[PDB]
Design a protein around this nucleic acid. Structure first.
Lengths: 133, 200, 310, 55, 148
RNA sequence: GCUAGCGGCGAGCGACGCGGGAGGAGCCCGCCCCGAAGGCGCGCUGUGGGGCCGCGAGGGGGCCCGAGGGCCCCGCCCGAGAGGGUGCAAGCCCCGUACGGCGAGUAGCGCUGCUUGAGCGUGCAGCGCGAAGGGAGGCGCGGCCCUUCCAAGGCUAAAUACGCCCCGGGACCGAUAGCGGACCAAGUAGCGCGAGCGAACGGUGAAAAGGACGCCCUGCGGCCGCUCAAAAGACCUGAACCCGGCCGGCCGCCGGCCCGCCGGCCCCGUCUCGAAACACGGACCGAGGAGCCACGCGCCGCGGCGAGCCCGAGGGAGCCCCCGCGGCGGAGCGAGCGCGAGACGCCCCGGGCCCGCCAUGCCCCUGCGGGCG
C-alpha cells in the first residue's frame, strides 16, 4: 500500500493526470525498456523515447523493428518507420500506425549530448540507491 | 398517538434553513485529537526539560456536595508561597503558578499547599550556568498534570462505644430536632408573648 | 491444555499454555452485532447539497391555465418538485444522519474474545474459507524473529502450511462488479492469514503478502478477527504475541472474561446420560386413525363393527 | 348540513363481540363505602390470636 | 433498518396505512399539545392530572447544592465496610473497637432506618439521623455520632 | 444538568453555579511623587522616570485472437500485490508505489420606551435629578450585621469558528441523476425597459486507417464494393410508442376444444350510502416521480452488566485498542419548614401493616421538641 497520503489513488484524479499532463511528464510517461545489450552498456532499465531511436515492437499487430520518425505526445503514441496501416491503393501516402511506447523495446538510442548527461545523472542516483539509500 | 405519553421538553428547531448555523457536526473529532496532540508535541519540543504543565494548587471542590474532595486550582496564594520562601516571580520562573486573587480561607489549605510546593521544589531541577547539552538532553520532560491531586478512598476506623456515648446527648434525634426548629419555636414564643399583652 | 509452538522451518520448538480467552463462549450473534455497529462507525458522510433544486426561481402558475399546479419557472418549465426534472429531492439526504452506532466496552470486549475463541476452532476456521489442511495446529503459534524480507516471510508460511491460503488470496485478485470500480474499490482479493505480533518487526515481511493482515496484540481488531461478520480468521500468532495474550486480558482492568457455557455436543451427551434416560417414561400407544369405509357392503367390513350380524 | 343525530344499531353486537364481562372478584369483596366502625372492629378483631399477622 | 420496516411493506397499497376516508393530512388535530382545555380535554384529564395551574411557592434561583441532601439506610451501613474487614468486625463484636463508619466520607449525609443493622456495635458518624435510625442503631449497641 | 424560572402560567420558552476537560499569562494608565532629565520646530494646560529534489525491483514458452492484459505450463521481485496507462482482465510492458537525500453629569434614583428565563425589573436607553466611601449576595421597603468585591479608564497569547482557493478521502451521484453548468467558449445561448431570469448539448474506432476501384449519371447522386475485427460511416448498445415493404390472419379478455365456434365478460384510478356512469383525471410510449433523516416521548423485543450502570468531553508518539466525570437508578412524600418506609409473600390480585402529607388523644427528656397510639 502507499503510505504517502499526499499522493492520490483516486481513479478520477490519476486519470486526469495522465489525460492532462504537462509535456515534461508526458515525455517520461512515454518510456520504453532498453535492450539487454543497452542495459549492460548504460546500466539503466528504461529511457524516455526520442525521435531518432531504433525500436523493436513486441506488440500484436505491427510487431517489427523500426526507427521512430514522429512522437505524438498528445495521443501518447510514437510512429516508427516501416510500420504503417494497409493502403487502399498503391498510389497513396503511407499512414504510420501509431504504436504505444510501452509496447516496444529500444534497440538503439540517439545519444546527443544531453542524453549522455541524462544517462550519467541517472547512473549516479542509481549508484547512491544501490549504496543502501 | 396519546395514551399515557410523557410530554416533550424539546424546543423547536430555530434557524433551520436560514440563519447563524445552529448545527455542530462532530466529524472533525478524530482529526481535532490529532491536531491537538501535534500542538502539544511541538510545544513540548520547544521546551524539552520544562514540563508543559505548571504546578497548580490542591483546592477543595466548591459546594457542600464535593466538600471533602480536592481538585487542581488556578494558582498558589502568596501565603502558601511565603511558607516555601518564594516570590511570585521566582515561583513562576520555576514553573509554580501564582494566584494573587486566592485567599486561603483555612489554616489547613495553606499547609496542604505548602507541603505540595516542598515536594515540587525537591523534584524540580534547575538547569543553569551554561547549558550542558548531554545533561539537558538527559533530562526527561514530565508529561501530564504535575503531581496529580488524589482523593483518598474512604476507610473504616475503629472506636470505643463509651467515648462516643459521652460526645452525644441521649435522644440525639430530639436534640437535632430541637436545633432545626429553634428559630421557629422562638418566633412563635415571641408572638404568643404579644397575644398575652393583649389581656393587659 | 498446551499449544505447540513451531519454528520458522516448521519443526516443533516449545509448548505454550493455552490462554483462557480461547475458552470464552463462542457467541456468533455478539460478533455480528458488534461488527455491524463498528463498521458503521467507519463510514464517511454523504449528502445532496442544500441548494440542490432550489436555486431556480419558480412559483406556481396556478389554477385556470390548463397546466398542472406545480411550481413553474418563467417559460412554464416545471421546477422545485421531486417529480420535476431539476427539482429538489422530496426529502434530501442530510449529513446529520447518525453514522456511528454505540457499543458498550464490555460487549466490544466480548466480541473480540468470542472471535478469538472461534479462531481456536478449526471447524469454524475451515468454514470461513481458509485452507487449513497443512497447518500443523489450530491455534498456530510460530517463532519468527523480526522478518524484514517478504521472501523470508513466505518461506515460513510454506513451512507452517499457511501458503495454500496465501495463494488462494493472490489468485483471487479480480475487478469488482458495479460502480465500486469507479469509486476507488476496483480490485477484490480474498482475505486469508492474519499475523498477530508483539516484540517483532514481522510487519515489513508479511505486509506485501496478498491477503495477509497484521495487528499488534495490544490492539486486536474485531473487523480483522471476523471478516464479513463471520467468526474464524486464520491467525498466525508469533510466540511473543500468543504468550502475552493473557497479560493483555489481565491489563483490561476490571474485566472478567465471559464465563464458558456448555456446547450443543455436551447437551446431547447430557441428554443421552442414563440419569435423564431413567426419568424418561414410555409414551402411551397412539390412536389408530384408519379411514371411513362403507361397512354395509362388505361382509368383512360389517364384521369389524358387527361381528354377530355377519 | 344535517347528519344523523343518533343510532343504536350494531352497538349491542359490538358490546357482545367479546363482552358481557363480569366485574372482577375483588370488587365483590372490597371495603369501599363499608361502615367505618365495622371496618375498625374487623381490624382489631383480626389483629388478635392466629389471624393476627402482627409480629 | 430501512429494509425491515413497515412502510416498505405498504407499497402498492396507495394510502400507505392512513385510510381512504381520512388520509394523512398536515396537522389534523393541531400542532403541539394545543387543545388541552378545549378539543383534547378528554386526554389532558384522562392521563395528565395537574397539567394546568400553579401549585407552590416559587424560588427564583434554586441552589442545587444547598438543596442536595444524600441519604443512607441502617441496612446499607455495613456494605460500606470492606468485605474482608466486615467479617472480623462481626464475630468480635468489640464494644472497645467497633468500626466507625463516617457516611459523609462515602457521600451520604442523613442516616434513615429502612431495614436492620446486624447485631454488632457500630458507631455511625453523620450530619443528621432519623428517629427509628437512632433507635435501631442504639439497640444494636452502636452510638449515633455527628461529624463536622 | 436542562432545570430554576418566564408565559392569554396558554401554545410555547429558558439560563447559570457546581463537577469533568481543552487551554492557560499576565498587566498598564489616570491619581500621586519628581519636573523637561522626554519621543526636545513639540511640550510645564505635563514629556519622560517612579520545503525541494531524487532514484526505484522483477517474464518467459506455447496455443489462440483484430489485438492479451485471455488460456495452459513454469518461474521471478515483494520495505514495492496503492493505483493509472498500454489493442482483451498486467506485481514482473511503461509511469508510479515501498525504501531516501540535502476614575462624576458618573453610579444610583424618579418617570417612560426597548430587551431578558430574571420574576416590585435581566441588560440598555431618553429625560428630570444627582452621590461619597461605594457595589453585590436570584422578592420589594426601613434598620443592624456578616461574607465578598472595588464600577463609572486601557491592553492581552492559547484553546474556538470558518467560505473562496489548494490538498487528500468517501458503503455518495452516474448524464431527466450529480452543481444551473461533465460537452475547448455555463451564468453561456436565449428572454426581459430594468431589477432579474436562464437552457439544451457526454460516448466512431485499437488506429482516421474518415470510405479503394469500376460502372451509370447533365448533374444531384445511385450501384458494385472498399478500409476495418466490425461499419461502428458521423457515429457504442439501439427499446417502447409510431410507421413502411413483404408475409400470414380477421380481429378484445377468460374458459373449452385444433382454433373459429360456443359460453362468460361494462372503464380503470378515485372520493363515495352507492360509479359503466350524462361525476372527475387519463391520446400513446419511455425515463424521473411521493413516509427518508434528525431529535424528544411512550411501550415492546434483544444483548452486556447488575444495586449498580455508562466508547461523555477528553487524554494515551494512541484513533475497531487502552484509560476516562457528571448523569441515571438506588426513597419516598409534602406548598413549604421538613420528615422519612419492613410484616408478612414463588408469581399475580387483594387485605393487613410501615413512611410522608392532614386531624385527634395520651405520656415525657435536651420541649410549638421527643415518644406512643
Amino acid at each position: 500500500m502507499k503510505l504517502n497520503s499526499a499522493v492520490t489513488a483516486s481513479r478520477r484524479k490519476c486519470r486526469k493526470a495522465y489525460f492532462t499532463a504537462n509535456a515534461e511528464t508526458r515525455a517520461k510517461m512515454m518510456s520504453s525498456r532498453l535492450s539487454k545489450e543497452l542495459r549492460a552498456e548504460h546500466k539503466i532499465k528504461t529511457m524516455p523515447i526520442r525521435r531518432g531511436d531504433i525500436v523493436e515492437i513486441f506488440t500484436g499487430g505491427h510487431k517489427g523493428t523500426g526507427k521512430v520518425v514522429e512522437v505524438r505526445r498528445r495521443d501518447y503514441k510514437i510512429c516508427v518507420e516501416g510500420i504503417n496501416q494497409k493502403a487502399r491503393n498503391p498510389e497513396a501516402k503511407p499512414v504510420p500506425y501509431p504504436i504505444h511506447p510501452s509496447n516496444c523495446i529500444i534497440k538503439e538510442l540517439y545519444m546527443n549530448g544531453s542524453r549522455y548527461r541524462a544517462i550519467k545523472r541517472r547512473q549516479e542516483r542509481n549508484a547512491e540507491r544501490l549504496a543502501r539509500i | 398517538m396519546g395514551r399515557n405519553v410523557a410530554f416533550s421538553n424539546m424546543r423547536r428547531y430555530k434557524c433551520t434553513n436560514k440563519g447563524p448555523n445552529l448545527i455542530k457536526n462532530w466529524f472533525n473529532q478524530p482529526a481535532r485529537k490529532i491536531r491537538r496532540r501535534q500542538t502539544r508535541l511541538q510545544k513540548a519540543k520547544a521546551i524539552f526539560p520544562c514540563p508543559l504543565q505548571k504546578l497548580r494548587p490542591s483546592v477543595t471542590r466548591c459546594s457542600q456536595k464535593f466538600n471533602l474532595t480536592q481538585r487542581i486550582g488556578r494558582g498558589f496564594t502568596l501565603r502558601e508561597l511565603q511558607g516555601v520562601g518564594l516570590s511570585a516571580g521566582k515561583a513562576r520562573q520555576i514553573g509554580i503558578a501564582v494566584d494573587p486573587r486566592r485567599k486561603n480561607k483555612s489554616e489547613e489549605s495553606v499547609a496542604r499547599n505548602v507541603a505540595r510546593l516542598k515536594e515540587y521544589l525537591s523534584k524540580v531541577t534547575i538547569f543553569s550556568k551554561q547549558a550542558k547539552p548531554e545533561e539537558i538532553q538527559q533530562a526527561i520532560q514530565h508529561q501530564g498534570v504535575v503531581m496529580p491531586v488524589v482523593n483518598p478512598k474512604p476507610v473504616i476506623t475503629t472506636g470505643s462505644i463509651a467515648e462516643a456515648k459521652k460526645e452525644v446527648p441521649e435522644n440525639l434525634f430530639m436534640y437535632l430536632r430541637n436545633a432545626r426548629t429553634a428559630r421557629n419555636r422562638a418566633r412563635l414564643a415571641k408572638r404568643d408573648a404579644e397575644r398575652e399583652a393583649a389581656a393587659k | 491444555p498446551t499449544v505447540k509452538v513451531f519454528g520458522p522451518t516448521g519443526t516443533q520448538v516449545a509448548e505454550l499454555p493455552r490462554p483462557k480467552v480461547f475458552n470464552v463462549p463462542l457467541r456468533p450473534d455478539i460478533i455480528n452485532f458488534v461488527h455491524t455497529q463498528l463498521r458503521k462507525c467507519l463510514r464517511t458522510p454523504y449528502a445532496v447539497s442544500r441548494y440542490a433544486g432550489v436555486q431556480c426561481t419558480a412559483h406556481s402558475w396556478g389554477p385556470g391555465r390548463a397546466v398542472a399546479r406545480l411550481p413553474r419557472k418563467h417559460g412554464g418549465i416545471g421546477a422545485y418538485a421531486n417529480f420535476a426534472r431539476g427539482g429538489h429531492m422530496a426529502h434530501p439526504t442530510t449529513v446529520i444522519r447518525r453514522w456511528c452506532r454505540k457499543v458498550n466496552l464490555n460487549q466490544r470486549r466480548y466480541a473480540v474474545a468470542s472471535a478469538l475463541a472461534a479462531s481456536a476452532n478449526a471447524a469454524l476456521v475451515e468454514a470461513r474459507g481458509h485452507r487449513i489442511a497443512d497447518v500443523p495446529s489450530i491455534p498456530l503459534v510460530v517463532d519468527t524473529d523480526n522478518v524484514t524480507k517478504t521472501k523470508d516471510a513466505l518461506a515460513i508460511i510454506k513451512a507452517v502450511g499457511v501458503l495454500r491460503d496465501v495463494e488462494r488470496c493472490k489468485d483471487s485478485r479480480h475487478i469488482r462488479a458495479g460502480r465500486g470500480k469507479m469509486r476507488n474499490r476496483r480490485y477484490i482479493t480474498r482475505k486469508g492469514p492474519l499475523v498477530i505480533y508483539n516484540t517483532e518487526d514481522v510487519a515489513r515481511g508479511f505486509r506485501n503478502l496478498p491477503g495477509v493482515d497484521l495487528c499488534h496484540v495490544s490492539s486486536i481488531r474485531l473487523l480483522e478477527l471476523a471478516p464479513g461478520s463471520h467468526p474464524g480468521r486464520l491467525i498466525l500468532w508469533t510466540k511473543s504475541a500468543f504468550a502475552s495474550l493473557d497479560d493483555v486480558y489481565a491489563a483490561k482492568q476490571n474485566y472478567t472474561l465471559p464465563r464458558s457455557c456448555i456446547t450443543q455436543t455436551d447437551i446431547e451427551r447430557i441428554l443421552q446420560s442414563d440419569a435423564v434416560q431413567k426419568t424418561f417414561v414410555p409414551k402411551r400407544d397412539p390412536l389408530v386413525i384408519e379411514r371411513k369405509v362403507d361397512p354395509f357392503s362388505s361382509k368383512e367390513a360389517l364384521a369389524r363393527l358387527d361381528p354377530s350380524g355377519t | 348540513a344535517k347528519l344523523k343525530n343518533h343510532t343504536s344499531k350494531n352497538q349491542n353486537r359490538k358490546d357482545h363481540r367479546n363482552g358481557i364481562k363480569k366485574p372482577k372478584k375483588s370488587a365483590y369483596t372490597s371495603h369501599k363505602g363499608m361502615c367505618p366502625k365495622y371496618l375498625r372492629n374487623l381490624r382489631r378483631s383480626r389483629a388478635n390470636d392466629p389471624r393476627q399477622s402482627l409480629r | 433498518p430501512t429494509r425491515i420496516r413497515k412502510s416498505r411493506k405498504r407499497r402498492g397499497h396507495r394510502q400507505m396505512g392512513y385510510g381512504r376516508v381520512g388520509g394523512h393530512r398536515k396537522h389534523p388535530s393541531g400542532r403541539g399539545k394545543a387543545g388541552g382545555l378545549q378539543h383534547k380535554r378528554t386526554s389532558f384529564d384522562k392521563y395528565h392530572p395537574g397539567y394546568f395551574g400553579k401549585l407552590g411557592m416559587r424560588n427564583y434561583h434554586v441552589r442545587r447544592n444547598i438543596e442536595y441532601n444524600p441519604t443512607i439506610n441502617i441496612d446499607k451501613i455495613w456494605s460500606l465496610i470492606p468485605e474482608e474487614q466486615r467479617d472480623g468486625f462481626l464475630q468480635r463484636k468489640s464494644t472497645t473497637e467497633a468500626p466507625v463508619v463516617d457516611v459523609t466520607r462515602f457521600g451520604f449525609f442523613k442516616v434513615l432506618g429502612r431495614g436492620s443493622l446486624p447485631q454488632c456495635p457500630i458507631i455511625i458518624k453523620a450530619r443528621y439521623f432519623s428517629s427509628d435510625a437512632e433507635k435501631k442503631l442504639r439497640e444494636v449497641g452502636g452510638v449515633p455520632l455527628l461529624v463536622p
